[PDB]
Structure formats: C-alpha cells, structure tokens
Design a protein around this ligand. Sequence first.
Ligand SMILES: O=C(O)CCn1c(-c2ccccc2)cc2ccccc21
Length: 136
Amino acid sequence: RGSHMCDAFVGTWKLVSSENFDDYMKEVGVGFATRKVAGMAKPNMIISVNGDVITIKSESTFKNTEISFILGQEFDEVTADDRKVKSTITLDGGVLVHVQKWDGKSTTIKRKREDDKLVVECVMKGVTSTRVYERA
Ligand SMILES: O=C(O)CCn1c(-c2ccccc2)cc2ccccc21
C-alpha cells in the first residue's frame, strides 16, 4: 500500500540513446534482419508496481512486450527478439538486475536511476550495451 524504493523506476520512459546495441545483439545471437529493425526502435517503457508485482511494458514500432513478475521469483519470458528464456529479476542495491537464461547461455540486463535518466546496461559475456531512457 505505501511507498517502496522500486517507485523511482515507476513511470513512462522514452529511449534517447543506444550504444553498442548491435554488437550486444550479435553476441546474444539475434539474426540480421531482427537486429536492424530492433536497433531502429525508440521504445517507450512503462514501469508500474501493484502490491508485490512489478510490470515492465515496452511499446515500439518493433514489438510490444510486457512482463509482470515478483522480485526473486523466476518466470517465463518471450523476449522482443523471440528467445524463450527463464528470467529472474532482483533488486540489488537499488539496481534492478534481470538475468535471462536459455540454451545454456545467459544475459544480464541491469536498470538503474542516474540523474533524471533510467540507464539500462545489457551484458552478454564481454560485450555491454548502454541504453538511456528519459521521462516521457
Ligand atoms: O530494453 C531495451 O531497451 C532492449 C530490449 N531488447 C530489445 C528491444 C528491441 C526493441 C525495442 C525494445 C527492446 C531487443 C533485445 C534483444 C536482446 C536483449 C534485450 C533486447
């Protein structure tokens, strides 16, 4: 019912910058045509919290996705690039840490507040992409 730290993430966010995302997606194993169309997208990401359930929606010309979850409880997720993964999202020190597991592989997406931005850092082995969103 009352305020939680998680509320710093809540709201409507628009992508403003993307660095190294094509190389990150190659590491993930996204095919060419999907990478090109995904990398063009300027999604809006809508984060909300209801009781213990956090919802992250991405809306764009590429794909609309929506996940709902409870921190530390694994779920099934079909990602925007069409992987079928098992995901767990935790809050570590203020950072939401989202680990996706599929086919023996793993990718971690961290989201954090920096100034008025929500920074999303996507990591697959040694390759990192930084995506910066701002309030809509
Ligand atoms: O949250 C994001 O900004 C990127 C989400 N995302 C996307 C994505 C694509 C288009 C629109 C939003 C997100 C592709 C993708 C591939 C691998 C891992 C994460 C991925």
